[PDB]
Design a protein around this ligand. Structure first.
Ligand SMILES: Cn1c(=O)cc(CP(=O)(O)O)c2ccc(C3CC3)cc21
Ligand SMILES: Cn1c(=O)cc(CP(=O)(O)O)c2ccc(C3CC3)cc21
Ligand SMILES: [Zn+2]
Ligand SMILES: [Zn+2]
Length: 229
């Protein structure tokens, strides 16, 4: 069920997992949805991605207060664009520890974003260096290589069938790869397939801008990227 809470929408995906959705008008595009995640890990909550704005991100924290009423231990942001990083100051005002790809933090200022407090680094095969992601509990963080951006990262939730490609993965009906502006058309297809191979148990693929999809979103994305090589 899609729970309306001020101008945002919350949908439960699993017993301990919810999707947050926020909207931003843009001319030529309409009121664009952006999704992130909320995970309960025992007596704390973990957030993946801000909303577009501080006010929206403050409303996510208000929804967590009312519907979960446990402290938010940390948030991880999946790339340095407004839809996933626009509410960083709201997280910092709430005393929430914040994490992003080192490259996301490096890009933040030129992208008009506020950097996270902590930088994630990755091994050669894409898995997060554990020292950089302390206390992440069931959040598994994977850098698939460059795609929608150079810095895009992905998350799976241990003990669920859920993984989140952020803006790397398009829905199975999408007509294009969308934002080519900061994209890596050469490496995109390999990056999409690497996400799939990182999270083989994830039957539910949470989309950046639409409803959850099947792993057909991953194949469709890879095939669309194969055309741009
Ligand atoms: C026009 N437009 C932007 O300038 C920025 C975004 C956010 P991202 O680049 O992270 O997808 C964005 C996201 C989705 C859409 C959809 C209506 C096509 C447009 C968007
Ligand atoms: C046409 N179009 C889409 O269908 C989907 C998106 C969002 P994403 O890059 O995450 O797929 C999208 C994002 C940005 C743009 C921007 C150039 C303004 C177009 C887009
Ligand atoms: Zn983006
Ligand atoms: Zn996007």
């Amino acid at each position: 069920g899609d729970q309306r809470f001020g101008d945002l929408v919350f949908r439960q995906l699993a017993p301990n997992v919810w999707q947050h959705t926020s909207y931003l008008d843009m001319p030529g595009f309409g009121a664009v949805a952006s999704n992130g995640l909320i995970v309960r890990d025992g007596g704390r909550v973990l957030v993946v991605d801000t909303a577009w704005t501080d006010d929206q991100t403050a409303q996510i924290l208000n929804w967590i207060k009312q519907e979960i009423n446990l402290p938010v231990a940390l948030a991880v942001v999946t790339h340095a664009h407004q839809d996933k990083m626009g509410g960083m100051d709201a997280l910092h005002a709430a005393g929430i520890a914040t994490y992003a790809n080192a490259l996301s933090n490096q890009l933040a200022p030129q992208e008009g974003m506020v950097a996270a407090q902590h930088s994630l680094t990755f091994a050669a095969n894409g898995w997060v260096e554990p020292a950089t992601a302390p206390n992440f509990g069931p959040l598994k963080v994977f850098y698939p290589g460059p795609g929608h951006t150079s810095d895009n990262i992905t998350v799976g939730i241990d003990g669920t069938d859920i993984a989140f490609g952020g803006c790397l993965i398009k829905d199975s009906k999408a007509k294009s790869l969308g934002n080519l502006g900061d994209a890596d058309t050469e490496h995109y297809a390999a990056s999409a397939r690497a996400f799939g191979a990182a999270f083989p148990k994830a039957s539910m693929i949470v989309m950046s801008h639409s409803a959850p999809d099947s792993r057909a979103a991953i194949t469709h994305t890879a095939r669309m990227a194969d055309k741009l090589r």
